[PDB]
Ligand binder design. Structure first.
Ligand code: BCL
Ligand code: BCL
Ligand code: BCL
Ligand code: BCL
Ligand code: BCL
Ligand code: BCL
Ligand code: BCL
Ligand code: BPH
Ligand code: BPH
Ligand code: SPO
Ligand code: FE2
Lengths: 281, 250, 48, 304, 42, 42, 48, 42, 42, 42, 48, 48, 42, 48, 42
C-alpha cells in the first residue's frame, strides 16, 4: 500500500555498495538493507522474553528476568539466565537500535531530507549504552547492570536506588532534570502553536506568523520565531541524557558512596570555613 | 473513591485515543492511491475522516483539507514493475522529467501573504531596511558547485522580518536569467563558498523565478527540491566523486 | 508501459497467468494439505 | 556602526515592527525593546513588546511576595551575614503549619509562619498567569488550547497543597519551601506510601513524561530536517500541503509505520501534554484518599 | 473510498477474528470449572 | 480486482501464517499434559 | 523500453528455465533434504 | 512471472531460512532440561 | 551472478560465521555448571 | 470591546454551573448530615 | 451575499419554525421520559 | 458593514429581539427550577 | 483612555464576584459549632 | 473603523450613555439587593 | 494618557479592595485577643 502522492517518490537505490538487492517495500514499511536486518533482530528478540521464562521462573513479562552477570567473574561470561543468556540479548537490542537509525539513511540518501535523524536516536544509542557497556567493564565484571523487565528493573531503581543517599544531590542528574521538565515545557505551547487559527473558535479567518508575534510576545517576553522552538524541541529531548550519562559515568564507578555526602564540598571554603551558620549552625 | 474503579474510565476513554488521534493525523495524504491513479488497497484501521471547513489566512477560498489529491501535475516514471511494490525509473535523465529525488507541485497563483498587505520573501533590493555603510562588507562573493568548480556569484540577500531570517541566496549569472537555491545545505568557511549538492554545470536547469522579487507558492516546490534531486543519484560511479560525496562529517 | 485509472494494476493477463498461478500455492499447501498434517494430530492427542 | 553579512546562515535584522492589532491594547506596551544583535544569525533577535497589563503583573507581584516570603525565611538562620546566605542558599529551609495544626491560620512567624504568605500571593500569580496564556490568544483571534495544557498542568497544583490538605486537614500535607527542602519531600511521598511503583497513576504520569521526549527528539529534528525545502514555516504547510509534508510524511510511515498531518503533529504533541500532570493530578488525588501504601495496592490490584 | 476491500482479508482480517478469539480464550480456558484441555485424566 | 502479489507472495505473505503458526507451536509445549514430545524422561 | 503482454520481465522462454530451475528446485534441494535429515532429527531426542 | 530470478531468488532463501531455522534453534535451546548439552546439568 | 560473490560472501560471510561464533560464546562458555578454566580457586 | 462574549456563553458558561456544582456535590454528598441517597436506614 | 448580523443565519423567523417547534416541543422527550426513570429512583432506595 | 457605536452589532433588530424575548422566558427559570431543588433539600433532611 | 468598556461588562459582573466569594465563603463553615445548616438539627 | 489615539472606541459622548444608563441603574442593585442581604449577617449571628 | 482612566479605577480598583484588604484579613481572624467571633462559651 502507498499514498496518493507516493507516486513520484518511488525510486531504487539509497543503499550503498552492492546494488538494490535489499530495498523491497513490504507494505507501509521500509525493508532496505537494514530492513531485513531488523527483521532478523525483531524475530529473535520476542523469544528473549520467553527464554528465562523457564529458567528464572514465570512466563509472564511481569516478572520475567534474564539477570546481568555477577560483579567479579571478570572480563568474560557468566552463568546463563543470570548473565550468559543476558549477554546475548544486548547485541540484538543494540544490533537492532543500529539497524534502524541507519536504515533511515537508505531513505535519506534515497530522497534528500536531512541527516539530523540518524542522530536523535543516537542520544538514545548513547543513553541505553551507558547502562550496558559504559559501566560494568571496569569496576569488576558485567554485574553492574539493570534487568530488562518491566517490573523487575522497577524494584531495582528505588528501594535499590539509595546507594548514593539521595540522587537529587546529584547535580548533573538534577541539571539533566533542569533539562527534562523543560521538554514538555516547550511541547505544550508548540504542540499548541499550530492548532487554533483555522480552528480559532469557529469561522474566523486564519492567523499568520504576525499573530504568533502578538500572542507569544504577548506571553513570556521571548519570541525566537517558529524555527526557534524546533530549536526548542530538539533542545529538551536529547540532552537530559548526556547530563544523566554524565550523572553516572562518575557515579558508582568513582562514587559508589553517598551523593548526599557531596553537598559538604560546598560548605568548605576558607572564608566561611570554621563557621556554622544556619540550619548547619 | 475506591481501590478499583478509576483505571476503567481510562482503559476505555483512552483505549481509543491512538484511534481518534491517528485519523486526525491521517487527514492529508489519504486516501491511499495506487501507482497510477487508482482507489488503492485501502486506508487502514484508522481510516481518513471527512474533512471540516477550513478558513484561509488571506481569503484563498474554500480549500478543504484533505483537498486536491488527484493527478494534476506531470509525473514521468517508466513503470518497471507493473506489480505494486518494485520501484520505477524515469525516462531519459531523471533531472528533466522531474521524478525520484526532485519533487514539486502545482498550486494556485497567489503567493504566501502575511498581514501587512504585502508578500513574504523579498531581496535586499526590495527592502531598504538594512544596508552597508561601515568598514568593508561582504555581500558579493564567488561560489563553487559539487563538481568542485566555480558556479557563479552571489551579491544579495532575500530578507525576512517576522522571523528576521533568510531563505534564498540569489546568483548573478553572466546574463541575468533568474535562478534559485536553498539555505540550510550551505557550508561556507572563508572567502569562497562550497555547495556539495549540484555540479556547476547544472544550475541553469533551476527555474528562473518568474519574478526576481516574488516567490509564488507554486514556484516554491522545485526551487527547493532540485538540490534534493542531486542527493540521491549523485554520483555514479568512480574516482573524484567517491572522495567528495562520501566520507565528510557535518 | 504506464497506467492511469481503476483498477489497474492489475491487470490481464498479468493477473491471469500470474496471480492465479501463485496464490493457490499459498491457499492449498496450507488449506487441504494442512489437513494432511491433521493426520498425526486429530488422534494424537485430544483423546488420552 | 553597521550590521555585517557573514558566511552561511543567513540573517537580516528588523527595524520597527510588532505584530497584529484587534482586541489587544495600544498605550500599554512599553518602548521598542533594545535588540540583542550579538551573533543573532541562528534564531531571532528582538526584545519586546509585552502586554504589561493587570492580567500579567498580578503575577509579577504575587510571584514576588511568593519570592520574598520564603526569602525572609532564607536569611533567618544564617547569622545575619552575606557569607552564610549564598553559602546555604539551599541548605536553608521552611515548612508549613505542623502535621498537627492544619485548618487554623493562628500560627505566628516562627515555627511555621512564612508559608502562609508566599502561596497566598502565588495563588493569584499562577492563577493570574493561567490567564496570560488563555486570553492573549483572544486579543487576536486564535484559540484557548495554550492554557488548556495549563489547566491540566495546574491539575497537579490542584492536589499537592490545595484539595487534599483541606478535606483531610493539615498543612504539612503541603509542600515545604526551599531548594532542597522539597527534595527531601519528593522521596517522602515515595516511602511513606509504600513506594509508588505499584501506583500506575503516579507511574503513568511518568509514562506521560517519557512521551515528551519520544515526541520532541524528532520534531526538533525533522522540522529542522525538512527546512531546506519549506517545513520551517508551520503557518503554510497544512491546508496548502507543501513538499515538507512529502519529505516528512513519507519519511516516518516507511520507518515506524505511520505518518501524520501537518496539523495532527500538534494533536499528539498536546495529547502527551494535557495528560502528564493531569494523570498526575488524579494519580496524586488517588494517593491519600484511596490506598496509601501502594505496595499494599499493586499486589491486590496487580498480582491478586 | 471510506471502505475498500482487497487487502484487509489477507493480512488483517485473518488476525481480526483471531484477535477477537484470543482475548476470549485465556479466561474460559482458565475458569473455575471449564478449561477443557489440560484435564482429561482424572 | 486490484491487489498485488509478485512482491507480496515471496517475502510478505509468508510471514502471515508464519505469524499464525509458529506463534502457537510454542504454547502446545508449555502445557504439562499436551506437550506431545516434552515429557519423555518421566 | 518496457513492453506490453504477459508478462515482463521476463522472459520467454523463462517460465520453465528461470521460474522452475531456481524456483521449483527449492521444492527439492531442501524439501526432500529435510525428509532425509529428519531421520537423524525426529528421534533426537523426543524420546527419553 | 515478474518477481526476481537473477536478484531475489537465491537470497530470499539464504537469510530467510536463517531467519526461520538458526533462530528457531534458540527455542529448542530454551530448555535447560532437554538440550543436547544440558542433559547432564539436570 | 546469481549470488554476489565479492559482496554477500567475502566480508558478509566472514561475519556470517562471526554470526554464530560469539553469541554461543555466551552460552557454552557460560552455563552454570561447566567453566573448566574459571574455577581454578574453588 | 476588549475581551469576548460569544465564547463565554456556550462554553465558559460551564465554569459557573457545572465545575461549580460537580465539585461541591461530592462535598455535600459525603456529608452524613444530609445523605438523601445515603439515608436508606441509619 | 453574506448575511447581516447575529445570528443570520438565522434567520427570521427560521428560528421560530425549525428551531422553536421541535427544539422546545420535541425536546420535551428530554423532560417527560426522564421522570419515568426518575420516579423509580427518587427514594428507592434512599429509603429501605 | 462596520457600525460606529454599541451595540451594533448589536443589532437592535437582533439585540432586544434576540436577548430579551427569552429573558422572562430565559432568566426566569434558572432562578426558579434551582429553588425547586432547594425547597426540597432545606427540610429533608438537615433537621435531626 | 487606554481601554474599552462594553464587553468585559458581563465577566466583571457574572463571575468576578465569586472569585472573592469562593475564597471567603469557606473560612466560616469549618467550625463544628457554627454551620447554621448542620446545627439546626439535633 | 478607528479614528486615532486616546481614545477610540470609545466614546464621546456615548460613554455616559453606556456607563451610566445601565452601569449606574442596574449596577446599583449591586448595592440595593446585596445590602438587603447584608441584613441577615450584620447582627445574625455575630451578636446572638 | 497612560494612567488608565476608565480602567484602573473600574477594574484595578475593584480588585485592590481584594489586594489590600484580604491579605490582612486572614491573620486577625483567628487571633484570640480580638476574637469577636471566636469567644464561644468561654
Ligand atoms: C532513587 C530515585 C532517584 C532516581 C533514580 C534513578 C536511576 C537508577 C537512574 C536514574 C536516571 C536518570 N534520572 Mg533519576 N531518579 C530520581 C527521579 C528522577 C526524576 C523525577 C522528576 O522524579 C527525573 C526527572 C529523573 C531523571 C533522571 C535523568 C537524569 C536520568 C535518566 C537517564 C535516561 O533515562 O536516559 C537513557 C535513555 C534511554 C534508556 C532511551 C534509549 C532508547 C533506546 C535506544 C530504544 C529502546 C527501544 C525499546 C527497547 C523498544 C520499546 C518500544 C516497543 C517497540 C513498543 N530522575 C530520584 C531522584 N534515576 C538514570 C541515569 O542517570 O543513568 C543514565 C538511572 O539509571
Ligand atoms: C521512589 C521513586 C519513584 C518516584 C517518586 C515520586 C513522587 C513522590 C512523585 C513523583 C511524581 C512524578 N514523578 Mg516519579 N518516581 C519514580 C520515577 C520517576 C522518573 C524516572 C526515574 O524515570 C521520573 C523522570 C519521575 C518524575 C515524575 C513525574 C512524571 C511525576 C510528577 C510530574 C511533575 O514533576 O510535575 C510537577 C509540575 C507541577 C506541579 C506544575 C508546575 C506549574 C506551576 C503550577 C506553575 C507555577 C507558576 C509560577 C508563578 C511560575 C513562575 C515562573 C517565573 C516566570 C520564573 N519519576 C520512582 C518510581 N515521583 C510526582 C507526582 O505527582 O506523581 C504522579 C510525585 O509526587
Ligand atoms: C532509566 C531508569 C530505569 C527505568 C525508568 C522507568 C520509569 C519511571 C518508567 C519506565 C517505563 C518503561 N521503561 Mg524503563 N527504566 C529503565 C530501563 C529502560 C530501558 C533500557 C533497556 O535502557 C528502556 C528501553 C526502557 C523503557 C521502558 C518501557 C519498557 C516502559 C514504558 C516506557 C514509556 O511508557 O515511555 C515511552 C516509551 C514507549 C512508548 C515505548 C514502549 C515501551 C514498551 C512498554 C516496552 C516494549 C516491550 C514489549 C512488552 C515486548 C514486546 C515484544 C514482543 C512483541 C512480544 N526502560 C531503567 C532501569 N522506565 C514506564 C513504565 O512504567 O512502563 C509501563 C515508566 O514509568
Ligand atoms: C468443544 C469445544 C471445542 C471448541 C469450541 C469452539 C467454538 C464454538 C468455536 C471454536 C472456534 C475456534 N477454535 Mg475451538 N474449541 C475448543 C477449544 C479450542 C482450543 C484449545 C485452547 O484447546 C484452540 C486452540 C481452538 C481453536 C479455535 C480457533 C481456530 C477457532 C476460532 C476462530 C478464530 O480464530 O477467530 N479451540 C474445544 C476443542 N471453538 C470458533 C470457530 O472458528 O468455529 C470452529 C468457534 O465458533
Ligand atoms: C493438540 C492439538 C490442538 C491444536 C493446536 C494447534 C497448533 C500448535 C497449531 C494449530 C494449528 C491449526 N489449528 Mg489447531 N489444534 C487443535 C484443534 C483446533 C481446532 C478445534 C478445537 O476444532 C481449531 C478450530 C484449530 C485451528 C487450527 C487451524 C487454524 C490450524 C491448522 C490449519 C492451518 O495450517 O492454518 N485447531 C487441538 C486442540 N493447532 C496451526 C496454526 O494455527 O497455524 C496457522 C498450529 O501451529
Ligand atoms: C444540597 C443543597 C445545598 C446547596 C448546594 C448547591 C449546589 C451544587 C449549587 C447550588 C446552587 C445555588 N445555590 Mg445552593 N445549596 C444549598 C443552600 C444554599 C444557600 C443557603 C444555605 O442559604 C445559598 C445562599 C445558596 C446559593 C445558591 C444559589 C446561588 C444557586 C441557585 C440559583 C443559582 O443558580 O444562582 N445555596 C443547600 C445547603 N447550591 C447552584 C449554583 O450556585 O451554581 C449555578 C449549584 O450548582
Ligand atoms: C470590628 C472589626 C470588623 C471589621 C473592621 C474593618 C475596618 C476598619 C475596615 C474594614 C473594611 C472592610 N471589611 Mg471589615 N471588619 C471585620 C472583619 C471583616 C471580615 C471577616 C473575614 O470577618 C470581612 C470579610 C470584612 C470585609 C471588609 C471589606 C469589605 C472592607 C475592606 C475594604 C475593601 O474592600 O478593600 N471585614 C470585623 C467584622 N473592616 C475596610 C472598609 O473600607 O470597610 C468598608 C475598613 O477600613
Ligand atoms: C534522548 C533520546 C530520547 C529518545 C529519542 C528517540 N527514540 C526514538 C527515536 C528517537 C529520535 C526514533 O526515531 C525511534 C522511533 O521509532 O520513534 C519513536 C525511537 C524509538 N524509541 C523507542 C523506545 C524508547 N525510546 C526511549 C527514550 C528516548 N528516545 C530518549 C528519551 C524509551 C525510554 C522510555 O527510555 C523507550 C522505551 C522505540 C519505540 C523506537 C525505536 C525503534 C527501533 O529502533 O526498533 C528496533 C528494535 C527492534 C528491531 C526489536 C529487536 C530488539 C530485540 C528483539 C528485543 C530487545 C530487548 C530489550 C530489552 C527490549 C526491552 C524493552 C523494554 C522492556 C525495556
Ligand atoms: C503538560 C505538563 C508540562 C507543562 C505545561 C505548561 N507549563 C506552562 C504552561 C503549560 C501549558 C503555560 O501555559 C505556562 C507558560 O506560560 O509557559 C511559558 C507554563 C509555565 N511553566 C513554567 C515552568 C514549569 N514547567 C513545568 C513542567 C511542565 N509544564 C510539564 C513539562 C514545571 C514543573 C515540572 O513543575 C515548572 C515549574 C513557567 C516557564 C511557565 C509559568 C508562567 C508563570 O506562571 O509565571 C508567572 C510570572 C511570574 C511569577 C513573574 C514573577 C517572577 C518571579 C517570581 C519574581 C522574581 C523575578 C523578578 C524580575 C524580580 C526582579 C525585579 C524586577 C521588577 C526588576
Ligand atoms: C537576594 O535574595 C532576595 C533578597 C532577592 C530574596 C530571595 C528569595 C528567595 C531565596 C527566593 C527563592 C525562591 C525559590 C527558588 C523557590 C522555589 C520553589 C520551589 C522549588 C518549589 C515550589 C513549589 C510551589 C509550592 C510547593 C506551592 C504550593 C502551594 C499550593 C499548591 C497551593 C497553596 C494555596 C494556599 C496556601 C491557600 C491560599 C489560598 C486561599 C484562597 C487561602
Ligand atoms: Fe510545532
Amino acid at each position: 500500500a502507498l499514498l496518493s502522492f507516493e507516486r513520484k517518490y518511488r525510486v531504487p537505490g539509497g543503499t550503498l555498495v552492492g546494488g538494490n538487492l535489499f530495498d523491497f517495500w513490504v507494505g507501509p514499511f521500509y525493508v532496505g538493507f537494514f530492513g531485513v536486518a531488523t527483521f532478523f533482530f525483531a524475530a529473535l528478540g520476542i523469544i528473549l522474553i520467553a527464554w528465562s521464562a523457564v529458567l528464572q521462573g514465570t512466563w509472564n513479562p511481569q516478572l520475567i528476568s534474564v539477570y546481568p552477570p555477577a560483579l567479579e567473574y571478570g572480563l568474560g561470561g557468566a552463568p546463563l539466565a543470570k548473565g550468559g543468556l543476558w549477554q546475548i540479548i544486548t547485541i540484538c537490542a543494540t544490533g537492532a537500535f543500529v539497524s534502524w537509525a541507519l536504515r533511515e539513511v537508505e531513505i535519506c540518501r534515497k530522497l534528500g531530507i536531512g541527516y539530523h535523524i540518524p542522530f536523535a536516536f543516537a542520544f538514545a544509542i548513547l543513553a541505553y549504552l551507558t547502562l550496558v557497556l559504559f559501566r560494568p567493564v571496569m569496576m569488576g565484571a558485567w554485574g553492574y547492570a539493570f534487568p530488562y523487565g518491566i517490573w523487575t528493573h522497577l524494584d531495582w531503581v528505588s528501594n535499590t536506588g539509595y546507594t548514593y543517599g539521595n540522587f537529587h544531590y546529584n547535580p548533573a542528574h538534577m541539571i539533566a532534570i533542569s533539562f527534562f521538565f523543560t521538554n514538555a515545557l516547550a511541547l505544550a505551547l508548540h504542540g499548541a502553536l499550530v492548532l487554533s487559527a483555522a480552528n480559532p473558535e469557529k469561522g474566523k479567518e486564519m492567523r499568520t506568523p504576525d499573530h504568533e508575534d502578538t500572542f507569544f510576545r504577548d506571553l513570556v517576553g521571548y519570541s525566537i520565531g517558529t524555527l526557534g522552538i524546533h530549536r526548542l524541541g530538539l533542545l529538551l529531548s536529547l540532552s537530559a541524557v548526556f547530563f544523566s550519562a554524565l550523572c553516572m559515568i562518575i557515579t558508582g564507578t568513582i562514587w559508589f558512596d553517598q551523593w548526599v555526602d557531596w553537598w559538604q564540598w560546598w560548605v568548605k571554603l576558607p572564608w566561611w570555613a570554621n563557621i556554622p551558620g544556619g540550619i548547619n549552625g | 473513591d475506591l481501590a478499583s474503579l478509576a483505571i476503567y474510565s481510562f482503559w476505555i476513554f483512552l483505549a481509543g485515543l491512538i484511534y481518534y488521534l491517528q485519523t486526525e493525523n491521517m487527514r492529508e495524504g489519504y486516501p491511499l492511491e495506487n501507482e497510477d491513479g487508482t482507489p488503492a488497497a485501502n486506508q487502514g484501521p484508522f481510516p481518513l475522516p471527512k474533512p471540516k471547513t477550513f478558513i484561509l489566512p488571506h481569503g484563498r477560498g474554500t480549500l478543504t483539507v484533505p483537498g486536491p489529491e488527484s493527478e494534476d501535475r506531470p509525473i514521468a516514471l517508466a513503470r518497471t514493475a507493473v506489480s505494486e511494490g518494485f520501484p520505477h525509473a524515469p525516462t531519459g535523465d531523471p533531472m528533466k522529467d522531474g521524478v525520484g529525488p526532485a519533487s514539486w507541485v502545482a498550486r494556485r497563483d497567489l503567493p504566501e501573504l502575511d498581514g501587512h498587505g504585502h508578500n513574504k520573501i523579498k531581496p535586499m533590493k526590495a527592502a531598504a531596511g538594512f544596508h552597508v555603510s561601515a568598514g568593508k562588507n561582504p555581500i558579493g562573493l564567488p561560489v563553487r558547485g559539487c563538481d568542485l568548480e566555480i558556479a557563479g556569484k552571489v551579491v544579495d540577500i532575500w530578507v525576512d522580518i517576522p522571523e528576521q531570517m533568510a531563505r534564498f541566496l540569489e546568483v548573478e549569472l553572466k546574463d541575468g536569467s533568474t535562478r534559485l537555491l536553498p539555505m540550510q545545505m550551505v557550508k561556507v568557511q572563508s572567502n569562497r563558498v562550497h555547495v556539495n549538492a549540484l555540479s556547476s554545470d547544472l544550475f541553469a536547469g533551476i527555474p528562473t523565478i518568474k519574478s526576481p522579487t516574488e516567490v509564488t507558492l507554486l514556484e516554491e516546490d522545485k526551487i527547493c527540491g532540485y538540490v534534493a534531486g542531486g542527493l540521491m543519484y549523485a554520483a555514479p560511479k568512480r574516482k573524484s566523486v567517491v572522495a567528495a560525496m562520501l566520507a565528510e562529517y557535518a | 508501459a504506464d497506467k492511469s485509472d481503476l483498477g489497474y494494476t492489475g491487470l490481464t493477463d498479468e493477473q491471469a497467468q500470474e496471480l492465479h498461478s501463485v496464490y493457490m500455492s499459498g491457499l492449498w499447501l496450507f488449506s487441504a494439505v494442512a489437513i494432511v498434517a491433521h493426520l498425526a494430530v486429530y488422534i494424537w492427542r485430544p483423546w488420552f | 556602526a553597521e550590521y555585517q553579512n557573514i558566511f552561511s546562515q543567513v540573517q537580516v535584522r528588523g527595524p520597527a515592527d510588532l505584530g497584529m492589532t484587534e482586541d489587544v491594547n495600544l498605550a500599554n506596551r512599553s518602548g521598542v525593546g533594545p535588540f540583542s544583535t550579538l551573533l543573532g544569525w541562528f534564531g531571532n533577535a528582538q526584545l519586546g513588546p509585552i502586554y504589561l497589563g493587570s492580567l500579567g503583573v498580578l503575577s509579577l507581584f504575587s510571584g514576588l511576595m511568593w519570592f520574598f516570603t520564603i526569602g525572609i525565611w532564607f536569611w533567618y538562620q544564617a547569622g545575619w551575614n552575606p557569607a552564610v546566605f549564598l553559602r546555604d542558599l539551599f541548605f536553608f529551609s521552611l515548612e508549613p503549619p505542623a502535621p498537627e495544626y492544619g485548618l487554623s491560620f493562628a500560627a505566628p512567624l516562627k515555627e511555621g509562619g512564612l508559608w502562609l504568605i508566599a502561596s497566598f500571593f502565588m495563588f493569584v500569580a499562577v492563577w493570574s498567569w493561567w490567564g496570560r496564556t488563555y486570553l492573549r490568544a483572544q486579543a487576536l483571534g486564535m484559540g484557548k488550547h495554550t492554557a488548556w495544557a495549563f489547566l491540566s498542568a495546574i491539575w497537579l497544583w490542584m492536589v499537592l497543597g490545595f484539595i487534599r490538605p483541606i478535606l483531610m486537614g493539615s498543612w504539612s500535607e503541603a509542600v515545604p519551601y526551599g531548594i532542597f527542602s522539597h527534595l527531601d519531600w519528593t522521596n517522602n511521598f515515595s516511602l511513606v506510601h509504600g513506594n509508588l511503583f505499584y501506583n500506575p497513576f503516579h507511574g503513568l504520569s511518568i509514562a506521560f513524561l517519557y512521551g515528551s521526549a519520544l515526541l520532541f527528539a524528532m520534531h526538533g529534528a525533522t522540522i529542522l530536517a525538512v527546512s531546506r525545502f519549506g517545513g520551517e514555516r508551520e503557518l503554510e504547510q497544512i491546508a496548502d500541503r507543501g513538499t515538507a509534508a512529502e519529505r516528512a510524511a513519507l519519511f516516518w510511515r516507511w520507518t515506524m509505520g505511520f505518518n501524520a498531518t501537518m496539523e495532527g503533529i500538534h494533536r499528539w504533541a498536546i495529547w502527551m501534554a494535557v495528560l502528564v500532570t493531569l494523570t498526575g493530578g488524579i494519580g496524586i488525588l488517588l494517593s491519600g484518599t484511596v490506598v496509601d501504601n501502594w505496595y499494599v495496592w499493586g499486589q491486590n490490584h496487580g498480582m491478586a | 473510498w471510506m471502505i475498500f476491500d482487497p487487502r484487509r482479508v489477507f493480512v488483517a482480517q485473518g488476525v481480526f477474528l483471531f484477535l477477537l478469539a484470543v482475548m476470549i480464550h485465556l479466561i474460559l480456558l482458565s475458569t473455575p470449572s471449564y478449561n477443557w484441555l489440560e484435564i482429561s485424566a482424572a
